[PDB]
Amino acid sequence: PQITLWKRPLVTIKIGGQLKEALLDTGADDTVLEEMNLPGRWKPKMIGGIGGFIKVRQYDQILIEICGHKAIGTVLVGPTPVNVIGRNLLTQIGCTLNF
Amino acid sequence: PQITLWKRPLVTIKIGGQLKEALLDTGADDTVLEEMNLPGRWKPKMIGGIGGFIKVRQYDQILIEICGHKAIGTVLVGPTPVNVIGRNLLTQIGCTLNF
Ligand SMILES: CC(C)CN(C[C@@H](O)[C@H](Cc1ccccc1)NC(=O)O[C@H]1CO[C@H]2OCC[C@H]21)S(=O)(=O)c1ccc([C@@H](O)CO)cc1
């Protein structure tokens, strides 16, 4: 799809078998989701944003479907204000910026 | 042009008579610029992201040139670690997400 930016680019994602809403975020290197139960092993990490740093649970090699496009990569889980899909997964679904 | 997301979507901008590097950021409602001494009136604002909130100064009807594309609108100035071009200006240069 071609997504204009007059509205927040929110899309439906599927992760851990559960549907969620997430923001396509070209300014995010990484994908950061709100607290949730995800199966598998994880390692604690720190990520920095506009307001400082937060502790997150890093899940590697996680299957995630974004608006009908499959991706498999790293998902950070922690107290983010919004579910953000970062470039690590945007590249996998072939997402580009165009003007 | 078309910008892939392998690396940060950094572009050159012109604002306040200065050239700067900034992110084309679909995850930002508004444009947020690193501290700079712009003339004119402003209004205090608080914006929140990963890590919490920062205090910024809101300037209205600021002219910004993004990759040769002219735009004019709201710019938030504060202690952000990066310059981000938000949707309020991305729409004005005809920027879309595509996959
Ligand atoms: C979290 C989003 C919902 C919101 N943010 C936009 C994001 O793109 C942000 C940009 C960014 C990139 C590098 C350093 C600091 C900030 N990226 C980010 O935090 O990424 C994290 C995860 O991956 C890593 O890579 C970079 C950092 C790590 S925000 O800047 O905080 C923000 C909040 C409110 C407004 C108002 O206009 C209302 O929207 C406008 C902008």
Look at residues B81, B79, B86, B80 and name the one whose alpha carbon lies nearest to residue B13. B86
Residue B28 CA to ligand 1 centre (angstroms): 7
Contact A11, A64 (CB under 8 A): no
Chain A, residues 46-85, CB within 8 A of chain B, namely: 47-54, 67, 69, 80-82, 84
- Give the nearest partner residue to B98 out of A6, A50, A96, using CB atoms: A96
Residues forming beta bridges with residue B11, ordered by sequence position = B22
CA distances from A79 to A36, A52, A53, A54 (A): 10, 12, 10, 7
CA distances from B56 to B12, B44, B75 (A): 22, 6, 10
Residues B39-59: b if buried by 16+ CB within 10 A, e if exposed: eeeeeebebebbbeebebbbb
Residue B22: phi and psi, rounded to 5, are -145, 155
For residues A21, A26, A29 and A30, what is the CA-based torsion angle, rounded to 10 degrees? Answer: 10
What would the DSSP string read from start to end of chain B?
-EE-SSS--EEEEEETTEEEEEEE-TT-SSEEEES----S--EEEEEEETTEEEEEEEEEEEEEEETTEEEEEEEEEES-SS-EE-HHHHGGGT-EEE-
Task: Say how far apart CA B83 and CA A96 lie, in whole Å.
Answer: 20
Total length of chain B: 99
For ligand 1, atom 20, name the residue with the nearest CA.
A28
Task: Say how far apart CA A66 and CA A70 lie, in whole Å.
Answer: 6
Contact assignment for A98 to B23 by CB distance below 8 Å: no
Residues forming beta bridges with residue B96, ordered by sequence position = A98
Contact A54, B51 (CB under 8 A): yes
Residue B78 CA to ligand 1 centre (angstroms): 14
Task: Say how far apart CA A20 and CA A37 lie, in whole Å.
Answer: 13
Task: Say how far apart CA B79 and CA A52 lie, in whole Å.
Answer: 11
The side-by-side arrangement of strands in the sheet containing B96-98 is A2-3, B96-98, A96-98, B2-3
Task: Say how far apart CA B14 and CA A45 lie, in whole Å.
Answer: 36
Residue located via tokens 């400082």: A52
For CA atoms B49, B54, B56, B58, give the dihedral sign.
positive
Ordered by start, the domain boundaries in chain B are 1-99
For ligand 1, atom 29, name the residue with the nearest CA.
B49
For CA atoms B11, B13, B19, B21, give the dihedral sign.
negative
Bridge-based pairing state of the strands B52-66 and B69-78: antiparallel
